């Protein structure tokens, strides 16, 4: 950096925090001074679909305490498929995050009135990514929270999922732009296994792009961003 | 004033549009649907078909009934209350017990 | 509470949507189809047609039946369970033996 | 287990899809057509229509029949074998001699 | 291929034979492909699906090559 | 809001707002002194006031402080 001690120090600092398999990106800052952000644990670029669900108006963000996590591969539109599962969670007390391909229609709508009343505490946020990348990434989340991806593709109905298939977390933070899972159950051995597998997916990455996204995901699942 | 249905026709009143209870505790918010249950308010003498005799209807005044809400059914306003006029042919069952 | 079908109408419940067994051992995953088999839960007195007398139905409470799933059939919710309302005309056979 | 058709309905099984013999020696390969011939496996008591009495069916268990394959006919699976359910109205003739 | 139907008679004979099965068709999609997954995901049968080598009139010529090398008949 | 499971028909006098007076012409509507739970006004103000704090641009900054003025001071 042409003898800029501050750049050196900031890089050094970043490298130290995100680890060896962590990503570091540079972008325009707001003010005059350089600034380093380190995102802890896993977080993807996803805002709540229902803004009328913010349970902390101070930050303008959703903060679900020790919740269940529903991973839906297919997009949701009907409250129907939820009822069997939505029910098991309601009679369990714990809140529920839902990361589907999408949530719209009267499904999204009714979910609002279900928390607006105090029947269940339930969040809805789009799936991270697009196309064949999404399902790959949605699985990452399953691993970190010990849940099963309900994939309509591989002969599975959303309706026939039980508490069994749900992921779990210590806490969840969702605002208008990003969702963050804080410390998921995550079978320790199954994390680093799914990491050492994606780690080798970069090894045989036949370009630069199928190299980038991969080591991004590893950072979300291993160190930091 | 009340109504007197004309033989074979039955006068009923509708019930709760997706009562928020189904699935258990979940307050299933209205999914853009209706209800098929209803209370029988008035009864006509009975179908006159086939000339010979006039057969009574198998639903009495005050029954709770599941019906098929199709074309046969009509909507009317009595004393400013929502009421339905269909024939027994459209009534499918009675909820008892 | 249970249901009381209105003469000629029969109240049945559906069975397993493409039970993974057909073809032998192969677990034929759902091919976007349904089932035509069902259990008879309630029976109406019987068809009243042609005035003179009221003929009983040939299906008893508790029969296993193959039906034709067409327009005649309707979907209802009793105690939060999926049930079907069709007339005997739509019931084709009984599975016994 | 076997099947018990519900009065008027007849349970049959289909025959060979364009048996390669027609025209004489020529093995007429499948031209995207079906067969109308079939074996009667089960019979219902008989049509109940017009109240008074219940008339038997003119086809016995084991007949070879030409039918009209239209809407009336339905497809079912018994012990994992292809069977057809139509009414006598759809059976046109019997192949004998 | 698009339907599991056409497979069942054959898929069955292989299932009761123990040996796995590769499928080289023109294509495999729909609920055919989907159900085949759950059939190996469980341990019912072991079955692979891969597109046919080539395109147009070259494909069938080449698909036959495979038949010869493995002693099979092109359906 | 028809969105969050509500029918216009099932609203009662309860849900209605109230004002001291209202002035409407061909171009502008003006509510003069509404009931407004004092504490709920400045709370809803201090909340929109912080919505400008985390306004990620200049436009989501403009409209916000416009609204605060309509709810707090004057224009």
Swiss-Prot record, chain A:
Residues spanning the signal sequence: none
Chloroplast found in the keyword field: no
UniProt KW keywords: ATP-binding, Chaperone, Cytoplasm, Isomerase, Nucleotide-binding
Record-given protein name: Chaperonin GroEL
Family: Belongs to the chaperonin (HSP60) family.
Subunit structure: Forms a cylinder of 14 subunits composed of two heptameric rings stacked back-to-back. Interacts with the co-chaperonin GroES.
Biological role stated in the UniProt entry: Together with its co-chaperonin GroES, plays an essential role in assisting protein folding. The GroEL-GroES system forms a nano-cage that allows encapsulation of the non-native substrate proteins and provides a physical environment optimized to promote and accelerate protein folding.
GO biological process: protein refolding
Location(s), subcellular: Cytoplasm
One GO cellular component term: cytoplasm
Gene Ontology MF: a single term: ATP-dependent protein folding chaperone
Swiss-Prot record, chains B, C, D:
Keyword Signal: no
Claim: Transport is one of the keywords in the record: no
SMART domains, per database record: Cpn10
PROSITE patterns to which the protein is assigned, alphabetical: CHAPERONINS_CPN10
Main location: cytoplasm
InterPro entries: Chaperonin_GroES (IPR020818), Chaperonin_GroES_sf (IPR037124), Chaprnonin_Cpn10_CS (IPR018369), GroES-like_sf (IPR011032)
Keywords, sorted A to Z: Chaperone, Cytoplasm
Highest taxon, organism lineage: Bacteria
Assembly information from the UniProt record: Heptamer of 7 subunits arranged in a ring. Interacts with the chaperonin GroEL.
Function noted in UniProt: Together with the chaperonin GroEL, plays an essential role in assisting protein folding. The GroEL-GroES system forms a nano-cage that allows encapsulation of the non-native substrate proteins and provides a physical environment optimized to promote and accelerate protein folding. GroES binds to the apical surface of the GroEL ring, thereby capping the opening of the GroEL channel.
Name of this chain's protein: Co-chaperonin GroES
Organism name: Escherichia coli O157:H7
From Swiss-Prot, chain F:
Locations listed in the record: Cytoplasm
Transmembrane stretches, start-end: none
Taxonomic superkingdom: Bacteria
Functional note: Together with its co-chaperonin GroES, plays an essential role in assisting protein folding. The GroEL-GroES system forms a nano-cage that allows encapsulation of the non-native substrate proteins and provides a physical environment optimized to promote and accelerate protein folding.
Binding partners and assembly: Forms a cylinder of 14 subunits composed of two heptameric rings stacked back-to-back. Interacts with the co-chaperonin GroES.
Family per similarity comment: Belongs to the chaperonin (HSP60) family.
Protein name: Chaperonin GroEL
Taxonomic source organism: Escherichia coli O157:H7
Gene that produces this protein: groEL
Section covered of the full-length record: 302 to 376 of 548
């Amino acid at each position: 950096a042409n003898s800029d001690e501050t750049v050196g120090k900031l890089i050094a600092e970043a490298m130290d925090k995100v680890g060896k398999e962590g990503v570091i990106t540079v972008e325009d800052g707001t003010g005059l001074q350089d600034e380093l952000d380190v995102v802890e644990g896993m977080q993807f670029d996803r805002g709540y679909l229902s803004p009328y669900f913010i349970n902390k108006p101070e930050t303008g963000a959703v903060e679900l305490e020790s919740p269940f996590i529903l991973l839906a591969d297919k997009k949701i539109s009907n409250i129907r498929e939820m009822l069997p599962v939505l029910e098991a969670v309601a009679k369990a007390g714990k809140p529920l995050l839902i990361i589907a391909e999408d949530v719209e229609g009267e499904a999204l709508a009714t979910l609002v009135v279900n928390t607006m009343r105090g029947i269940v505490k339930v969040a809805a946020v789009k799936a991270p990514g697009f196309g064949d990348r999404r399902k790959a990434m949605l699985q990452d989340i399953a691993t970190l929270t010990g849940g099963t991806v309900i994939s309509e593709e591989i002969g599975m109905e959303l309706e026939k999922a039980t508490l069994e298939d749900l992921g779990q977390a210590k806490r969840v933070v969702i605002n208008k732009d990003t969702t963050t899972i804080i410390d998921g159950v995550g079978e320790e051995a199954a994390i680093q296994g799914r990491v050492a597998q994606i780690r080798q997916q970069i090894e045989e990455a036949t370009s630069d792009y199928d190299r980038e996204k991969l080591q991004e995901r590893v950072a979300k699942l291993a160190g930091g961003v | 004033m009340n109504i007197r249905p004309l033989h074979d026709r039955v006068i009923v009143k509708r019930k709760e549009v997706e009562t928020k209870s189904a699935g258990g505790i979940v307050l299933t918010g209205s999914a853009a649907a209706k209800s098929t249950r209803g209370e029988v308010l008035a009864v006509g003498n009975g179908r006159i078909l086939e000339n010979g005799e006039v057969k009574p209807l198998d639903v009495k005044v005050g029954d709770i009934v599941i019906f098929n809400d199709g074309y046969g059914v009509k909507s009317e306003k009595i004393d400013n209350e929502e009421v339905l006029i269909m024939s027994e042919s459209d009534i499918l069952a009675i909820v008892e017990a």
